[PDB]
Amino acid sequence: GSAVPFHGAHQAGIATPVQDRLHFAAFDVTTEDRAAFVALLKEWTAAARRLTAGHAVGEGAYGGLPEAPPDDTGEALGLKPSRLTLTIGFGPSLFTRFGLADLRPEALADLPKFPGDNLDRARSGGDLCVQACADDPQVAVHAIRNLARIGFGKVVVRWSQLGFGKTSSTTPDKQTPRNLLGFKDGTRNIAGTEKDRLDRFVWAAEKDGTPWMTGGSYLVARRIRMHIETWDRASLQEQEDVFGRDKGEGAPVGKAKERDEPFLKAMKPDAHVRLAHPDSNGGATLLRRGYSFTDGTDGLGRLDAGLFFLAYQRDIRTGFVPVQRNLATDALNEFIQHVGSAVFAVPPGVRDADDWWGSTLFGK
């Protein structure tokens, strides 16, 4: 497939097929005028309509008046849409502006402090987020970079994160991707094909108390480093004890195939799978849509790499929070450290060529 439809009852980039690359970015609002903001959201929408179809924003990247800066920076010229999806989310701090306090959804709870947290405030939070996912990373980077240029004067970029998963051009789509620890990551997850589960664990409903979120979701972002050098020193058995599956095939303890249903009582008490399993959390279930990241080498010469964890849910208090809390005694905690965090209320979708991002929240 080449492109994903931008319009719909929901926003693309949540339930849709997971793309290869990612450029996440959290924005901070720098304007007080609500009409100027609404105007940006419409300009941003019009630009995303062009970005997700492989076209240049505005009037184009060249050919215009020579004395005028081009509307598009043009580093996407000659590339394909690449399954580009642009998902916008509203964070708690946004609702303290424009008189939106009383409309902040109660499902957008602030995350509590979890044991072991070492969050970098500079790389945390944000008034807005754009999740740019595509098979080609330059198409993602081009979209964030142009969306930031468009909104310059009304929004800035708080933090940005590049990620990567599979290379679909060479990796089969049905092959589970492996995280940087060497384990198949994503076996037991909510797929976008399961409309009944999405209606129960991901999408927000009107009765949930916030009508303007009817059709939207709530996103949780966690930047989790991995102690690559120590993990590579643990024995194969220790490694498999941590998760409760075997590294080669990814199968649960006592089973032969990856996708067999696990038998938790055979896993060690502090195994990752055993604790994060829904049965172990009053039925809490998540849609994990994260990416691996590798930013380079830190001061101490260690690999600055990990998982950019993303999770979509119908309510943050019945999704990420119960599950993350249960991971207090995770044996994986020895080899990981959360260092970035933010949450967002992702509104419903752009219904047609007249609608615009956040039209249910800001009205018409």
Next chain:
Amino acid sequence: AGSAVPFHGAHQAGIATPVQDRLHFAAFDVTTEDRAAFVALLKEWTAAARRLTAGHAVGEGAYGGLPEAPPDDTGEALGLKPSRLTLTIGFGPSLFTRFGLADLRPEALADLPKFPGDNLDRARSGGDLCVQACADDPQVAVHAIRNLARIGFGKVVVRWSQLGFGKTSSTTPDKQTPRNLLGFKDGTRNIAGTEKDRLDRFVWAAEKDGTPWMTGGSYLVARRIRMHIETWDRASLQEQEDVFGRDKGEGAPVGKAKERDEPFLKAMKPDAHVRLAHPDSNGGATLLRRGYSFTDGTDGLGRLDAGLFFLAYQRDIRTGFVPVQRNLATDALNEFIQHVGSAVFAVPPGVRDADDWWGSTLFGK
């Protein structure tokens, strides 16, 4: 199709090879003083490079070993294709201050002069040796550097690394020329992998140059260049085009109509980037540029921080990067870029067969 690039040859792969879509560059610093210990590491690295470039796990594998033993391969590449992985090794001038290699530091491995406008981070510059990991799959390149580093534990350390999310170079003039983050095509007039007479003239060293052990190798100049994205995106279309000498949409030289139409340099502004970099403007000095675009989060001040990891292979740095870089002192592009990291490496000749090993010509075999 994720096919593999042959690891053996008279030269190392990753130079004249078609530019791959991802990069993981890593400079190392030698910790051990034992010359026999380092030579052994070189033979261990070479063995792992044969496995990785072929799409196989290093050592005895990623699993199946003793449950009490750590796996030889970290396993994050299992189930992936070679993805055109290349691993190119280089020796830095600081490596010759040890193991008794002083008399073998190649004269062509010239230490760069101080260029005006530079603000080089010394912690992200230099290095006793380098390993260039290029591939169409980023998890493959990373998996390669990580496992090479783990094998060299106790004998080498990573000084700095640099990941390239996208190529800004081309050794294949027949394929689409990629674009840097300034929106312009980058790699139009560059040495192609099929142009042997030019590769022999500008890239591959020779025993006549004075360093026999470097016959068949090349010399690398790495330069981390930050881009002032904010000031560039304020310029007009005509200013951006006057900066380089080519138009933006087609990439043709000024006045012309097609990207690969040869330039008429007198029609460009006297400070046009193309006009000063052209070989005709540098006594015929020609480079083999093989760089990648990079992103580094945000400057912490509300702005995306991005740039270009510039790599240049040449037969002799004194006649390649140095003269061309000096001619860009007046370059109009200088008002939008800044060089913030730098390193040079003497890339030895390639691994001939399964009995050879990286740096065998230098260290004797």
